[PDB]
């Protein structure tokens, strides 16, 4: 439905949608912009990520509320209320999976293959890991292990590039490590790996802060604080 709108107009409207907190619209505009077939600039990649993270974030929060209700309903002593809780949890789950599949589809056709600079390639591979991780959060069947491995593989390729091509304080590198650490802790049942990654990432960033301007220092330390927050929660 965005095929008739100019690329620049889609970008302009994505920014307006962000200001209005209309994240579904924002994501539709940015999907339209991606489907024009040109590479995305740094700002445009950030708009794409903001839009879909907010959309899926609302779905994930709703899914967790419904999953908790469903789990309580299957405890000993709980009254049978019928299929409605499961049905509605499934409805939200299916919508969430659809958004993840949409993002993964944009990455595969054709954002990743055209992304040659480290900042773009790592950004998109992190996104791929993230949306496979959100699929893993709801997966229960025979492909769960393969979904988990798809997240792991994308994160690992992003880590390998980021370590070779970016300084330890780069905000993309830091946010990637933060999310891969969460993957290890929450998805892969590897809390020690999660803690080791968060600690090493934090310490290597600390040692590189001296090279930065004030503005870059602010950007990097904000994400380092998220790593510290998780270390405090987990240890």
């Amino acid at each position: 439905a965005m095929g008739s709108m100019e690329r620049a107009s889609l970008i302009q409207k994505a920014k307006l949608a962000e200001q209005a907190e209309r994240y579904e619209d924002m994501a539709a505009f940015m999907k339209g912009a991606v489907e024009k077939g040109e590479e995305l600039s740094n700002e445009e990649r950030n708009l794409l990520s903001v839009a879909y993270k907010n959309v899926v974030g609302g779905q994930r929060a709703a899914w967790r509320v419904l999953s908790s209700i469903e789990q309580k309903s299957n405890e000993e002593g709980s009254e049978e209320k019928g299929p409605e809780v499961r049905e509605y949890r499934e409805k939200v789950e299916t919508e969430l999976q659809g958004v993840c599949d949409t993002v993964l589809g944009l990455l595969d056709s054709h954002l990743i293959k055209e992304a040659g600079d480290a900042e773009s390639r790592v950004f998109y591979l992190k996104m791929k890991g993230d949306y496979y991780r959100y699929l893993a959060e709801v997966a229960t069947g025979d492909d769960k292990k393969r979904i988990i491995d798809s997240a792991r593989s994308a994160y690992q390729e992003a880590m390998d590039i980021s370590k070779k091509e970016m300084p330890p304080t780069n905000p993309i590198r830091l946010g990637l490590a933060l999310n891969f650490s969460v993957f290890h802790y929450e998805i892969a049942n590897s809390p020690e790996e999660a803690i080791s990654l968060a600690k090493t990432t934090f310490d290597e960033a600390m040692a590189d802060l001296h090279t930065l301007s004030e503005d870059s220092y602010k950007d990097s330390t904000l994400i380092m604080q998220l790593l510290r927050d998780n270390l405090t929660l987990w240890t």
């Binding site: 903001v50 974030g57 933060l178 929450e186 927050d229 998780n230 987990w234």
Partner: peptide
């Protein structure tokens, strides 16, 4: 406290 992942 819910663990942190990267900002949108």
């Amino acid at each position: 406290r819910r663990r942190k992942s990267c900002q949108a």
